[PDB]
Amino acid sequence: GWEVAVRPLLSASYSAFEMKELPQLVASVIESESEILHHEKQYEPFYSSFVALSTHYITTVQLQSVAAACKVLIEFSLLRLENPDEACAVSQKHLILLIKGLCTGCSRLDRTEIITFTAMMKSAKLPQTLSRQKEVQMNFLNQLTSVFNPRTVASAIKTKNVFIAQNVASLQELGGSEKLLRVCLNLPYFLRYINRFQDAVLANSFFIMPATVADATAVRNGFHSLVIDVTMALDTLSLPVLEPLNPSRLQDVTVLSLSCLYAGVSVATCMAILHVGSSSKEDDYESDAATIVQKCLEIYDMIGQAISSSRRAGGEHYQNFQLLGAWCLLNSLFLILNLSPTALADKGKRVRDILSRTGHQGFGVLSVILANHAIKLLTSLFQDLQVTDGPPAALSIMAQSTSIQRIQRLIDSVPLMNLLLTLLSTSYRKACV
Amino acid sequence: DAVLANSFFIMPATVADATAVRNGFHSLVIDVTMALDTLSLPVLEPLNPSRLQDVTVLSLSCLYAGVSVATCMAILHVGSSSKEDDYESDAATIVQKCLEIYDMIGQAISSSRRAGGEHYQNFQLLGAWCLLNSLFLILNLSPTALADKGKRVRDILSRTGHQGFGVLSVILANHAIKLLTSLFQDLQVTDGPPAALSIMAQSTSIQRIQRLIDSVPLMNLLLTLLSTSYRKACVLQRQRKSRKDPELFLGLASNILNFITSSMLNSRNNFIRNYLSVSLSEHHMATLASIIKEVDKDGLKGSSDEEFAAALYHFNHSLVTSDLQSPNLQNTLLQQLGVAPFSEGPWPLYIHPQSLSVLSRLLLIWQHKASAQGDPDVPECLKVWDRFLSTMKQNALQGVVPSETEDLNVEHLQMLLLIFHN
């Protein structure tokens, strides 16, 4: 039965996990494998919560069976992250943290959620409401059929290392890298940012629309979903799912990272506009803006590091990545520093229109952070340049160009010297004030 | 010329030509030292395509020179004071400096902001190609037959005792195995042309590995190095009771075996598994059986022996379990081991642990497959039980008291009982 199968988790929910309770849990997970992936709607939350508790208790601490069970759970979480159904007891975010935790040292789930998971455990109805020789022979057959590594990869650290190696091998076997990247690309909230980046790169111009103060407020009040999305995307990108950098995979990765940087730039512009136009809610808003911009920069840096060190993408792609990042950051800085105090802000109730048509109470910590990252990209590019008036370097990761072409494209986008002197003056004035 | 002709050239030629190439080793030493010092300066950063071509030309030619001096020293040793000691020290120094130059150039290419992963892959491919061709050439040296009758690699392949080898061979094999494991780990994550041997070429990992296979039959070469290295290590260990120590050769053997297990046996790719299934031969099983007999007869000796035993155990069981060897190959292995289920002599009542492990693994796999499919009882198990009973009955009739290492260790009895239960 299933009641006796879930009994060890019910007993252990009030304590740690007894060592003697693990092998039968593994046996039950392997035995029901044929059914776990195929279920009706009303049993689904029960099985989701059971999987959550099982994974949690496995990660808190014969290796072949554990690896098989972990592979089964990873497969379950994978197709649960692909489909996700409305009535899933565990949302997509906790599935992402669970998959990460099985590949790491179990520092994702918290008690505040497993209490609700056990409550749902009790409140859910069984499939068949919750409110020695056979196992040895199976283990013998499992050890006989396949050979565990062991040494191809003090005691606690090596057991943890082999556990992580087995788990990541199982994850890669299912091809979860492509599925995770696909699920991260077609997010319901990053979609607008990705589309905006596509239009900006196609039209050669830079777009930001916090627009007026009212539009800035409208963009606000939905910031918490953006925080959740950026956190989950960062956790997904922290997993080793990026190694086979095919050209299409490269394009997808740069699209995702650059759109995330675009989102950070946009929230920075929104906060600056709000401050120019002008409790606990405002403090929450500013803390959330700081968190999202920091996470966006972290994602950008992680993607850049992955691109630079990869054995399929080399120096040219890293240079193009740095050029795109610097272009976005510099255009953003020019836009935010061109904000009027009251004139254009009130009369408004792009960068090409601003250039065609052509008080520094904006700025802030976000502006400083963006300027620092832009200056790092710029010094890297200029150090590269140091060692025929052609076209500006194409804004694609697969393009070929020289350093002079990239610098000339940056100059064509924005007058750099005047901009730099403007930020220097404004920053010193703010510091002295 | 070698890259243009798709072939590999080394001409130490005979002993006289080897001596003629020698006696000029001091100039080569001074040249490699000055080249290494020049390459140590920061004068490599702007890697234009032409500069890349020049750098790879220089580094690969230096590696070629190290390979050539290694071949010359090996030929001199096969053919056969302070001068000889100076010559061997010079050879060691020049090969070490050549390897250092190659590694420095490779690291510079990998970390450069103008040359990326593809160029590093091509660099590794060229290095591995040169190293493997050199190893094949040196390990195919004849003792006296072709050496005296001679008074390339394509002619050798067209026309088709191991007192050569040495420390230089071990170092070259180690570097080649490092390049090979890097390339195969790259592969892991349409029968086209082999990958071009140019630093600017575009190719997939399958293409590079297939080019390496085309140049030299890899599996036979690797097994030959494993066998020769273990033989030299065991001979040196017997004589004892860098060259004077046997742990180096034992480590090389363990490393090559571990490479074979991790990169090929556990590989998921279909093409490499097909190649492994095609390229396994009965002579390889005979060599493996002789290695097993040596390791079980010698017994536990030292820590390096423990590591080599672990590697051999892992290789044996991975080969047995992962369904590449055809059944006749398994029968050949058992027959060579002397524990063939269809033999006619008395059943050996004492089985050494390694042979017992492999035999039990094979028999239990057969029994499990037969039970799962529905086949009636496998004739091999019935035959082994019958032969055990007949031998034991004969010994009972003769009233013979065996020795402590002669009949019926306990693990053998447990294994037979487990067979009986199924």
Numbering used by the authors:
A (entry chain B): 28 to 88, 96 to 162, 166 to 168, 185 to 206, 230 to 354, 364 to 434, 443 to 451, 465 to 493, ...
B (entry chain A): 275 to 354, 364 to 434, 443 to 451, 465 to 493, 502 to 553, 640 to 820
Text taken from the publication that reported this structure:
Aside from teaming up with various ubiquitin ligases, UBR4 activity is linked to two specific cofactors: calcium-binding protein calmodulin (CALM1) and KCMF1 (13, 16, 17, 20, 21). Our data show that the evolutionarily conserved UBR4 complex forms a megadalton E4 arena, in which inward-facing ZZ-DZB domains of KCMF1 act not as E3 ligases but as substrate receptors. The architecture of the E4 megacomplex is conserved across eukaryotes, but species-specific adaptations allow UBR4 to perform its precisely tuned quality-control function in diverse cellular environments.
We reconstituted the human E4 complex by co-expressing UBR4, KCMF1 and CALM1 in insect cells and purifying the ternary complex via a tag on UBR4. Focused cryo-EM classification and refinement yielded density maps that resolved all folded regions of the human UBR4 complex (HsUBR42/KCMF12/CALM12), except the flexible C-terminal extension bearing the catalytic hemi-RING E3 module. Two UBR4 molecules dimerize through two remote, structurally different interfaces to form a large ring-shaped assembly. The first interface is composed by the N-terminal domain, involving extensive contacts between adjacent Armadillo repeats. Moreover, UBR4 disease mutations are spread throughout the ring scaffold, highlighting its crucial role for proper PQC function.
